[PDB]
Amino acid sequence: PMPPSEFLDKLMGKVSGYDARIRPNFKGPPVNVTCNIFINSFGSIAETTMDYRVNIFLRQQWNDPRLAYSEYPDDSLDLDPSMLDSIWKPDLFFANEKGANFHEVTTDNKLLRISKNGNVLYSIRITLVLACPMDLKNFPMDVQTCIMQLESFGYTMNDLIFEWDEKGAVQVADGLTLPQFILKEEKDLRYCTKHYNTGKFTCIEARFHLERQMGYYLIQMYIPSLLIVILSWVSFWINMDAAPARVGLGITTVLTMTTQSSGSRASLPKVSYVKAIDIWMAVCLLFVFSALLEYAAVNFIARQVEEMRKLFISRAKRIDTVSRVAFPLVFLIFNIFYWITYKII
Amino acid sequence: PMPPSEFLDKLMGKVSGYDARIRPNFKGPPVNVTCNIFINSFGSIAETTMDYRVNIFLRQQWNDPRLAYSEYPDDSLDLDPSMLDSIWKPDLFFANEKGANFHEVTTDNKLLRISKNGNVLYSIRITLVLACPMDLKNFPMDVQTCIMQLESFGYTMNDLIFEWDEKGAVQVADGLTLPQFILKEEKDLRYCTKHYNTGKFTCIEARFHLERQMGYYLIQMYIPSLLIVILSWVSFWINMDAAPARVGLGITTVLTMTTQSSGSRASLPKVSYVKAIDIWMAVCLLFVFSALLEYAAVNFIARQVEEMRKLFISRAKRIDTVSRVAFPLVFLIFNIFYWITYKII
Amino acid sequence: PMPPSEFLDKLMGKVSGYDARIRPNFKGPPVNVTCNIFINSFGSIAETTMDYRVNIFLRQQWNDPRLAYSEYPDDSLDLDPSMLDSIWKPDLFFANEKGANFHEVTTDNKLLRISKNGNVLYSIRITLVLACPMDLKNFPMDVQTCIMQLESFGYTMNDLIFEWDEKGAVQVADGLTLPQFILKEEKDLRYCTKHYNTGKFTCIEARFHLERQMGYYLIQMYIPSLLIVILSWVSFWINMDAAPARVGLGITTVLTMTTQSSGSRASLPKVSYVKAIDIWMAVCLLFVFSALLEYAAVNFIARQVEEMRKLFISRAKRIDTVSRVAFPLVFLIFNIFYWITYKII
Amino acid sequence: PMPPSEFLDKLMGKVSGYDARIRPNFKGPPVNVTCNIFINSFGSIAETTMDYRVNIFLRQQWNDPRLAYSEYPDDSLDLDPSMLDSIWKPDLFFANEKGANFHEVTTDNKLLRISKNGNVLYSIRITLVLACPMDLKNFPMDVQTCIMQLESFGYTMNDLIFEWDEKGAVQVADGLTLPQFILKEEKDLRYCTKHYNTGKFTCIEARFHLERQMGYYLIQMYIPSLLIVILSWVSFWINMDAAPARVGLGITTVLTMTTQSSGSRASLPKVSYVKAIDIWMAVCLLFVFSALLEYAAVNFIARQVEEMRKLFISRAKRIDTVSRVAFPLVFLIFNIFYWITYKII
Amino acid sequence: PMPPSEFLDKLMGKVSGYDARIRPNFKGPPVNVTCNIFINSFGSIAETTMDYRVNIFLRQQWNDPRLAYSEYPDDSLDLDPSMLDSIWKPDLFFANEKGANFHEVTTDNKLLRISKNGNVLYSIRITLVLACPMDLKNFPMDVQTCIMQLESFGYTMNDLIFEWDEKGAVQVADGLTLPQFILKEEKDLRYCTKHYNTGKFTCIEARFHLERQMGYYLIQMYIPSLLIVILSWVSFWINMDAAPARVGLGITTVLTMTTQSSGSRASLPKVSYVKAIDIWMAVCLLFVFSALLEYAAVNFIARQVEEMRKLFISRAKRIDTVSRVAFPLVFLIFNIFYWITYKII
Numbered sequence A, B, C, D, E: 001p002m003p004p005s006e007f008l009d010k011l012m013g014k015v016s017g018y019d020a021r022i023r024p025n026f027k028g029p030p031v032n033v034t035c036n037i038f039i040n041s042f043g044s045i046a047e048t049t050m051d052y053r054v055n056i057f058l059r060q061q062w063n064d065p066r067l068a069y070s071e072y073p074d075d076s077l078d079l080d081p082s083m084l085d086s087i088w089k090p091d092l093f094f095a096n097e098k099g100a101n102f103h104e105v106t107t108d109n110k111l112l113r114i115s116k117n118g119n120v121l122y123s124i125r126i127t128l129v130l131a132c133p134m135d136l137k138n139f140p141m142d143v144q145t146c147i148m149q150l151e152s153f154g155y156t157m158n159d160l161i162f163e164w165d166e167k168g169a170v171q172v173a174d175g176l177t178l179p180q181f182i183l184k185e186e187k188d189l190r191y192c193t194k195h196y197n198t199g200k201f202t203c204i205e206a207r208f209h210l211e212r213q214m215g216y217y218l219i220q221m222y223i224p225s226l227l228i229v230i231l232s233w234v235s236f237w238i239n240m241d242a243a244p245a246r247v248g249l250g251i252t253t254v255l256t257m258t259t260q261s262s263g264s265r266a267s268l269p270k271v272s273y274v275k276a277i278d279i280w281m282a283v284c285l286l287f288v289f290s291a292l293l294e295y296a297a298v299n300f301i302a303r304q305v306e307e308m309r310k311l312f313i314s315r316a317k318r319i320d321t322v323s324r325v326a327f328p329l330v331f332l333i334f335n336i337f338y339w340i341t342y343k344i345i
Ligand SMILES: *[C@@H]1O[C@H](CO)[C@@H](O[C@@H]2O[C@H](CO)[C@@H](O[C@@H]3O[C@H](CO)[C@@H](O)[C@H](O)[C@@H]3O)[C@H](O)[C@H]2NC(C)=O)[C@H](O)[C@H]1NC(C)=O
Pocket: A025, A029, A030, A031, A032
């Protein structure tokens, strides 16, 4: 029979000389560790901090020949997660953690099973707040590439090597969605081998190609800033010569743009370059700034003979018949050159 | 007599070979674990994060025949919560925790009693910050369905199965209320069995049908945005022909709507679809945007013969006698089609 | 002599069979635990969360006859707080903790002394963030009743009963004050016995009758909203007939009320009922909304014969001589009915 | 020789009967503990919470005759900070901690040396978030007195007494500065002996006299509120009789004061009394509120004979020649009485 | 052979008398500890708190002759990071931590190797939130010098001395960048030896010369405040004599500057001195405040004979022909003196 109480201690403890402080295949080749991650929760992709919180099941597989068993009849032993403090485990860390933690609610969220030949499957639940540097040039239409790279902190490349396994290195939960992005399906899997003045260390990362749902920004930034571009066109059809209302209408619209432009970047890092939403909020700040300046020409020109008196006002109304149509052709010639530049990535 | 000092150690320790690393009924059927939760505190249902904090008493019951006792005369042993580190306990976890913790103030908030036949009751106090993806299409009248699902992380479906017990799987505190929602009474109880590339794992979740108290939004969003819809009607009865006040009144009301519309979504996630409060705050942004545009017609028309001079102004006042009544019929024909669409779920 | 080194171990350890896993008077009556709390720090009474942080010295007293000593000559043993992990201690918890923690700076902040007859005094320092549901109907003049109830999580009512002691169950620090409230002196002390499907459990709570310092709100909400009620009275004495200023003055005052009304509830939960500060900020939103509407009558009436021309304007100035005095009598007849309703609780 | 390996264990362990659970001089006089603190970091003096974070080196000295050594030749033993779990240590705590923690980065930040006669020096690094109730009557010119008091939680006054040592009880880091305050040099050192219903307990506190750098408030509150007091003087020199601009200029300035007054207390607790910055922001709210009201007199008076027509307007311009100079004498007679009241503490 | 299981215990444990509580070279010279840091993550350089979060690999090297081995054939032993609790380690701490923590995700992020002669390499991953006092005189063009100094808390200068090693004391990650600053390449390395009343303690710090990316501030503060400086120039070309629009245009521009000036310092500490962005936001607050005051002269002068009537208005238009060009020469003579003062550091 060989009950399971004795078999457990006969594999880890003083008998058989298992020493969890000494890696497998000592004084031999490296310990080929194949990895893959399941993603439960993805999101909270902040940009004030330029990080993102993920929740994964880190699986790992290596081969420890000291963990070989033939006395037992079946082909696997999913064991107590309290066993994990007794076997060797690779010292994987996330080279851009910025804060990570296990989960220990009602039990350690850990798994451990050991095939007959000695293979190990070590799945643990982790929450990471990974650091990815956002490139925000073409901001509302950007395609971020946030990474997560799994280094080794203490074993060099000739003692512990990581790998992704061939059959589906990165799964995703069945209905996993994001509030603002959409995780594209192709997930890169490339090496990131590290060299320090201590030596070289195994590294393997997995690129995630995020992508913004532009829909939210077509409802708060673009449309609400395309109306005020139209109110600045209201300052033309009124009285045809002059009034304090045109200056009033002009001054107010320039007020909203200044306030609305500031609120546009209210929740972004203070990057030192001009991003895509800036030139929009800058061009719409001209066509409002031009109307209030356009009136300054006519009212100045109007307050400036026997027969030239009638033609004198034609010097002004000839403007308002051009400005009233010159603007809505330039804003539409710009607005088509804009979206073709960013929808062409 | 058999005092309780000796009886405790005679059930757990080296005698009798209890091994807390090996589940009950080893090499046999699964371990049928029946669960139910008491809910002390429910609330803080955030939406910037799309999660909610709960505070529950997780009860559990299974059957461990090794914990059977006949030497003792009474029918239960509510034991020391320090005992829990010595018996088998299922590795239940909350598949969408997003952060959970026990409570250990003045003692571990844990319970443990063991009937004669071997049944176990294991009640622990937990605080969870569970993740539920909010569907915010019809926002102020939405009916969220936030879940909480109790998986098993290390034992497969042929070694540990969960269940809800038939008699009241989900109680609630006696006077439990919510600040913004109302927890409906019917609580779904369905299976959520999981398949990974490690195997299959037992899962059972409990749907909670939340529902917004719409009263708060009929005091800050709808009513305060129904007044400014009326001030935009003030721009009609004044002077009957033209004045800088009508442009002034019109410009200001459009200012409030833009600011108030932005503040409407000041505390929501940046979802990429149009929600119910948006089309209201958009339609009320037209009827203000139309009045300021409506004046642009009359003032343009007025500043445009022997007998046609009197009828010429009738070309304008015929407008203001229609606009002054055409608007308050369209806003009321829309406002009835709106609330019938959302009160019909 | 019997030095204190040997006497300590002779009371707890293997000798005498003290078993901290087994309550006093086993198989007998319950363990009458008398409690009382000293309050160091009270405050941070939030309402976005509807909780409050307290800092207390929880004292407890029971009787453990196994802790009786006659070899020692003196009448008390204030002992090492490291002793507390060795004696029985009731598993008191705070049924609405929402987060609590001990203090362990320079030592565990714990006390322990043991009279000769076996009494125990167990004082520990705790920080609690207790949950009290705020009732905010009459908001700036409300009288909250936040509680704190001390249940037992694992022992049923026939094995552990709590009580408040008769001589001053709830002290308070000598000069303890609050930033916004004033802790009234009478502190209720009533039972809160709990019944679950596990059994019944001892409970005893202590009501604290908070009460708002209304002074802060008579400086930011009421007075700053009583001036703008007066500026809306400025729109009467100017020009006696009409001007764009009256519409200008009216429009601006309605702007401030809308903005100021929103800021009034800027730091409150989104309760689904109308609170006391709302009807004030609503009534003051009418008397501003009426002036801007009051001008719409006169200016409409004025722009509407041989002898009736002079009496025609009297149709308007008869208004402004009434509105200029009708308002400051209604606002004062309302303002007296308001404060009598809320100062009468 | 007597190497240091054996000498350490010969002082703490089973030999010599050192019992860290029993204070020095048992059954004798109290244990005179002399204290002093070095202050590394001081600041983050919040007022929404009314607390302040400090970072100190708590030194302590007492006399434990059991720690006397003559076998060793030198006059001190700066020992391993892992030793501290083995000797007696007074249970000092900070009676207004509100949250404190050790530092354990690269080692416990702890010190321990033991002179020959038995003296002990026990220096530990601590971060405290101490609670000091702010008195904000004369707010921008206030002089806070935040304290920190070092009580004993478990030993009564006849078993453990604290003291400050005579030679410099409170040092400060060499270039320690504060962002908003300036820590005055005199630091009070007085007793705070406590009496509870458990007994009396040793206490000694150290007052810190903070003091605000008023410079920041002479750049955002006072100067920016002294300009708008001047724009309200702009409403006099324009047109000498009346215009919609004066009402426009008046209405806008009253707008800024209301908004700016609210922003003045944007980051303060909701205290129930009138603070110094309030009467300034209230008096400047009158001189703007008076100009807009001052125009209401003239414009009302102007729109009210054969020879009295010319003198009739003199009834108005006599005002504007007084108001244009009466104001800038009252604002300067108030502004001198103000600063003499608060610069005289 | 001498397998690695026995060799490990033969170096640390009871054999050979290694005592981790006693430094190397006891009763001899100090323990020369050479340090260097690798910087993974740098950033979150806050200023409300005046701190910055870093993420480093602290390496250390000393010489412990008790850790000498000749039985083993190879020249290094990268060992289990669980070994670190058994060897001597210097008690380095960061004298301005303000909060630090190790990383323990999937293993302690620690390294340990031991050359044959006894050298030790001890690399650990750390996250620090270091305190650097910001000097914000010339704010958007400032050059901060944030430090990090590595003291010894318990060993005096005659028992433990730190040093930087000569070959590259401070590396940086390969593509490390910052959101707002740029870490200059020269990194100072100077001593900071400390003297307390406990003795003297080894200290060595490393200055980091940060430097602001001024680009962000040329897009939100300077340019958006250079437009409104131009709108205040719009108040000249309109009507050449007077209008309510000029007062309207003037009043509004002064509004934006006041609001925009406040928002300029919306995210900075309340420093008690005038910083560089203040005099810009103050000078631009004059040229707007002068235009609204400039109109007060002309409109006052205009409303003030047979032949002097025509020359009387020339007394006013002579102004507007000077003010319309006097301003854009002073703003450009100031604007060149400004940037030469701050680009000259
Ligand atoms: C872990 O994975 C590595 C790489 O996949 C394995 O290294 C490879 O080991 C094989 C033998 O097992 C080597 O083949 C031998 O190479 C020599 C040249 O040195 C050549 O004469 C023959 O082809 C011979 O078979 C192979 O070179 C070597 N490759 C590398 C890149 O190291 C390693 O064996 C794996 N270890 C375990 C425990 O699985």
